[PDB]
């Protein structure tokens, strides 16, 4: 019913119609997560080469 904020221009026009009213981690921590996971890869690869060495 109620049209408001009607703005017009050459390109077009915009407006709002209301029908009814109502009723972060740091760079440190990131680098710590990535490197920690890198160690877990290194440990896993080391255990493999240790196992293969046997």
């Amino acid at each position: 019913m109620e049209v408001i904020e009607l703005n017009k221009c050459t390109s077009g026009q915009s407006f709002e119609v209301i029908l009814k009213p109502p009723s972060d981690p740091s760079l440190e921590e990131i680098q710590k997560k990535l490197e920690a996971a890198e160690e877990r890869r290194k440990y896993q690869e080391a255990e493999l080469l240790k196992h293969l060495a046997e």
């Binding site: 690869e45 493999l48 080469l49 293969l52």
Partner: protein, 427 residues
């Protein structure tokens, strides 16, 4: 993404040679190593298997291994024998006498370093090596014993690369010696640990297919190898031609292997055809879909109705309605949903390639990770236990330095593999 091919032993080199023969024709490469095709689809991903030389010469990235020069000399005189890089011919003289111990511990250990020097020379040329693929039997000594030794040493030097294998399983129906169950069990133990992907090619199945289906009264190793080369070409299609699904060895493993030890695949193929005998009638898509799933078409002597499919990879080849493929593929899963585990949603993945194989207007290759594969390993275990309970024919191995405990361990680990496959069959 380059793949380094290796073929070990009599069987490995004979199917390996047949493999390079088949796909070389598909990629329009002649025995001279020159391209003479009509489509650019053939050369887009030809670098995966072929090294390019000056004058546009394509040389297989293949390494031929054997502890005796007998079979490898036959390859070099064979049809495409000249295409192979001569320096990649690495061989001994003693042979392994169908002895796993000889191939893995004594005779083969003497030769393995020479092989790894060739592997290293190829790998250094690779822009981005994705992994290796091996062709060998598990019933012999070289391909089984030395093959698994190579795999172990390749993993040590390339632990972040994929290891694939085409492993031919032994069978009494097609038997060279009585000690094949021993060599096989010892090899499975190695494959469970040091491979990401293994295509189980049962000689029992290849025989039954040639006998029962293809009506060949007395099939030879040549008849058996017609099926292998057909399957080998199919399962590598997605790797050799431009595609979205399972284009590389790793992505295939991620989609096919829910658990690291359970990576032994049942290959299937349709239409089944014998050598020479040309078929004139092209199969409909419903026929390809029905056949490729039938037990009579599996390359591994296992009943897929006795287990459940963890994952499945299918590849239709030729010119067809991809819509009809999607329909028929969905029809199988919906008709027989019980034979697909419910705890892996959408575990079936289909692909299509325009280029069909030679002789056929269209075909379909099946790759299934079924729990029913245990029937294969159980069969080997029974034949193993039958001899081992009396320690029969064991002196061939202890004479090479092996202990009885190592057999007991190999036996136990394969029985574990069986039980693990059984675990997910009743989940």
């Amino acid at each position: 993404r380059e793949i380094v091919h290796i073929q070990a032993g009599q069987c490995g080199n004979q199917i390996g040679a047949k493999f390079w023969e088949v796909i070389s024709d598909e990629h329009g490469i002649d025995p001279t190593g020159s391209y003479h095709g009509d489509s650019d689809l053939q050369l887009e991903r030809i670098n995966v298997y072929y090294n390019e030389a000056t004058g546009n010469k394509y040389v297989p990235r293949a390494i031929l291994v054997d502890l005796e020069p007998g079979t490898m000399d036959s390859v070099r005189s064979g049809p495409f024998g000249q295409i192979f890089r001569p320096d990649n011919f690495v061989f001994g003289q003693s042979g392994a006498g169908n002895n796993w111990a000889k191939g893995h511990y004594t005779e083969g250990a003497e030769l393995v370093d020479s092989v790894l020097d060739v592997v290293r020379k190829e790998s250094e040329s690779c822009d981005c090596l994705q992994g290796f693929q091996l062709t060998h039997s598990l019933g012999g000594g070289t391909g089984s014993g030395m093959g698994t030794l190579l795999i172990s040493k390749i993993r040590e030097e390339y632990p972040d690369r994929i290891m694939n294998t085409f492993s031919v399983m032994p069978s009494p129906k097609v038997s060279d010696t009585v000690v094949e169950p021993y060599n096989a069990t010892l090899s499975v133990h190695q494959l469970v640990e040091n491979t990401d992907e293994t295509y189980c090619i049962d000689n029992e199945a290849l025989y039954d297919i040639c006998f029962r289906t293809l009506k060949l009264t007395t099939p030879t190793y040549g008849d058996l190898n017609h099926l292998v080369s057909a399957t080998m070409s199919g399962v590598t299609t997605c790797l050799r031609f431009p595609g979205q699904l399972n284009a590389d060895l790793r992505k295939l493993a991620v989609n096919m292997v829910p658990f690291p030890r359970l990576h032994f695949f049942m290959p299937g193929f349709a239409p089944l055809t014998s050598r020479g005998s040309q078929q004139y009638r092209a199969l409909t898509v419903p026929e390809l879909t029905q056949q490729m799933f039938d037990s009579k078409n599996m390359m591994a002597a296992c009943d897929p109705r006795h287990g459940r499919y963890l994952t499945v990879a299918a590849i239709f080849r030729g010119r067809m309605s991809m819509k009809e493929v999607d329909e028929q593929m969905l029809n199988v899963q919906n008709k027989n949903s019980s034979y697909f585990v419910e705890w892996i949603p959408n575990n079936v993945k289909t692909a299509v390639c325009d280029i069909p194989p030679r002789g056929l207007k269209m075909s379909a290759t099946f790759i299934g990770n079924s729990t029913a594969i245990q029937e294969l390993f159980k069969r080997i275990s029974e034949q193993f236990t039958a001899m081992f309970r009396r320690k029969a024919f064991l002196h061939w191995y202890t004479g090479e330095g092996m202990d009885e405990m190592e057999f007991t361990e190999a036996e136990s680990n394969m029985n574990d593999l069986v039980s693990e496959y059984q675990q997910y069959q009743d989940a």
